[PDB]
Design a protein around this ligand. Structure first.
Ligand SMILES: O=C(O)c1cc2ccccc2cc1O
Ligand SMILES: O=C(O)c1cc2ccccc2cc1O
Ligand SMILES: O=C(O)c1cc2ccccc2cc1O
Ligand SMILES: O=C(O)c1cc2ccccc2cc1O
Lengths: 154, 158, 157, 154, 158, 157
């Protein structure tokens, strides 16, 4: 009965995120993608849909929204592990501070894994920015997500 | 002879990480001034008087440390009090590259030195901002703050 | 034939920037300083002021020119028939973010980014820190070109 | 049937290592501590004994020695995950390079987890050095290990 | 006008990460010299001639790039050839702080500039040393090295 | 009453080190430069040479003294009734390792470590890089005190 939570705002989910989801799904019996309710581009419902569409081939993964402390989200589902992806530009020092705080207040472990090099420079924010000015980010997002992004811009 | 250093911050609220730095500064310098920043824009959770009071309660055993508020250029605060050293603490999550930039700038414009000290591992992941955030949602940060600060913090959230 | 673009908001240009401009001008046949303007946030200096301050402090570099733009840097670069960006490094540079942007810029447009460390004397000035220090009276005269310093004090007063 | 490998030379195992072992053991069904055969202080057999003694309360953990590529060690046991601890002084950039190489050549994922703050500054090398000159490292090593270290020095 | 840069290393053997840097330098400078270090102490896997040959095969499409061996101070190699720029690549695992130190030193003693460029993500985790180590134990690094280098490497291991 | 120890192998002392010595001497009542010797590896300079080069370049600091030692730094510090180390930071400093050692030193002996950044002009010299550069003829005269430079060239010849 192993399991981990993969947190984020995912506005929108990128192939970097999906790579991490797939690795978590391959190494834990159960994975929950935790979508933060927090001024963004997609609604929570749209963000969940896009992740669900992109993870249809991962039977042991589900997608849920949440608010407040991540460790409460994790513990209320009977788990005590977080899997977080690393990419170029991740503020790792801040992630370490939060990992140590999260272990202290709730006994939740955080496992970090590097995203694949091909997806190591995409972020939700940079993808939106580049797409806004007509840059081609189609190789960096799930095909579904890419078309919905184009819709939001145009 | 008379040595001295300034320990700067907003301290909203003071944490055990801050206190650890205060104690080390007070042990190594004849005089220490904790400089509490007043910021006219972003008003935090505690007033400047409340922040000073919380620092004074926490540093009651440090006779050579005093607490003062201030505004503007830190190196002016320092030099106005006849000193020319700043002691700053490092924790997990400190933007150290930015701290180094500011240290080199402060040396250049006013001849003030900056000494960095790492907080104890037990207190290395607390920050004022993260403590407030965790406490707001009912997380237990009582092991990371002075006892009286924790009491006051619970009060401000109700 | 060779050429590079040196990008920034330059609000105002510092001696750190000028050091990088000079090195690029010495190593490439042409250099274009790209003054990138955000149409949705005014800086301290207008575009014409920014360009004027750069021109006055680069007058001894015959192969350097200054132009403003907005939107994607790689479009600015490519529309001028170039394929290289030269970016300075200083103390406090978010290099991980710069690397992310460099890899994205190469991916979307085939543009290369070359980083160069600014001289130690100029390694701790930034436009933002110079403005902050000068706002509260600190002496930044040694860190900014003559074309900038008193104009900066002017804006603050 | 989840599982991970925790690699090292462990010469000797520290409480920082043990903290990582315990977290891996809590989050994966099976954990293998992989002890490198590589000029050190303890023999491979002694290093294994010390880890086994220190992990007696972890029923799903075993300890084995090995040589050559770590990913071959991992894959030959039917697993494809490595759990590696982080401490103050870890050369993380090099660990990331190796993680990306290991994923490329064998499809093995590497999960990084920060050791507890109390154990974040001990290393096998620094513990030996300090102990050699009479420094007290008893709070940083398993009680068994500490006494055997004293034996090797005296 | 005539611009130029030197790309230094031991290249034992050259990798696709190196080649990526070579290609970018050759695209941006009128002339590029790949400088192959001879070290009298630590003799690696390939002789200097073999290393030069492997680089030349890999750079056959770069007419403005040439390969030369050298010894001693890199800035002397650079200045002796009438140049004053070095182009160095960055990958995962590069000791960048040390590279910055050396760049500032090289500017100070000889007025030589150093331009850093990040290798493509696909080639960002290969290094000469790690490629040899993985290959020695039968790992497949053929996607990370030029085709002829891979062939030669398999030969040296038998 | 107050005091700090400035440790290193100082083989040879650089202007980066001297900058740190001067700042410590200005901020503490006494400063001891601790020349740490490895009995199992000879450096370029003997202990007496190292100490002599430091004394000659610190003659204008009346509250600084120079002593050699070996073994645990914290024993050197504590046996002199002190409890503070002052260590310089430069470009290329392995700060993560320095932090690890600082936390260990606090744990085993209660000794505090204060880090200070050396001046930008001296931020890229190290004993090791100065020796390497000078070995192959590079000019490091501006990075080392007069007490060192020609003695260094002497050793290399
Ligand atoms: O930082 C996050 O990504 C985050 C995601 C959450 C997702 C669901 C509930 C709480 C959450 C808290 C977070 O800090
Ligand atoms: O950044 C600070 O912590 C700071 C504190 C001050 C405290 C008193 C006066 C000026 C100050 C300036 C600062 O930048
Ligand atoms: O780096 C290691 O810690 C390591 C441990 C091993 C342990 C057993 C077999 C191979 C191994 C290879 C390694 O690189
Ligand atoms: O570090 C190097 O890669 C290096 C290469 C050289 C190549 C040719 C001549 C001198 C050289 C000096 C170096 O430090």
């Amino acid at each position: 009965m192993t399991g981990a939570v993969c947190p984020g705002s995912f506005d929108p989910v990128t192939l970097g995120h999906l790579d991490v989801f797939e690795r978590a799904a391959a190494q834990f019996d159960e994975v929950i993608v935790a979508v933060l309710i927090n001024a963004g581009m997609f609604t929570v419902d749209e963000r969940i849909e896009m992740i669900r569409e992109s993870t249809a081939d991962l039977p042991n993964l589900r997608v849920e929204s949440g608010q407040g402390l991540l460790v409460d989200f994790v513990r209320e589902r009977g788990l005590n592990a977080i899997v977080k992806g690393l990419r170029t530009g991740t503020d790792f020092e801040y992630e370490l501070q939060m990992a140590q705080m999260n272990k202290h207040i709730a006994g939740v472990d955080t496992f970090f894994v590097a995203t694949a090099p091909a997806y190591s420079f995409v972020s939700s924010s940079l993808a939106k920015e580049v797409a806004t000015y007509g840059g081609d980010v189609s190789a960096l997002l799930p095909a579904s997500v890419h078309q919905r992004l184009l819709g939001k811009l145009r």
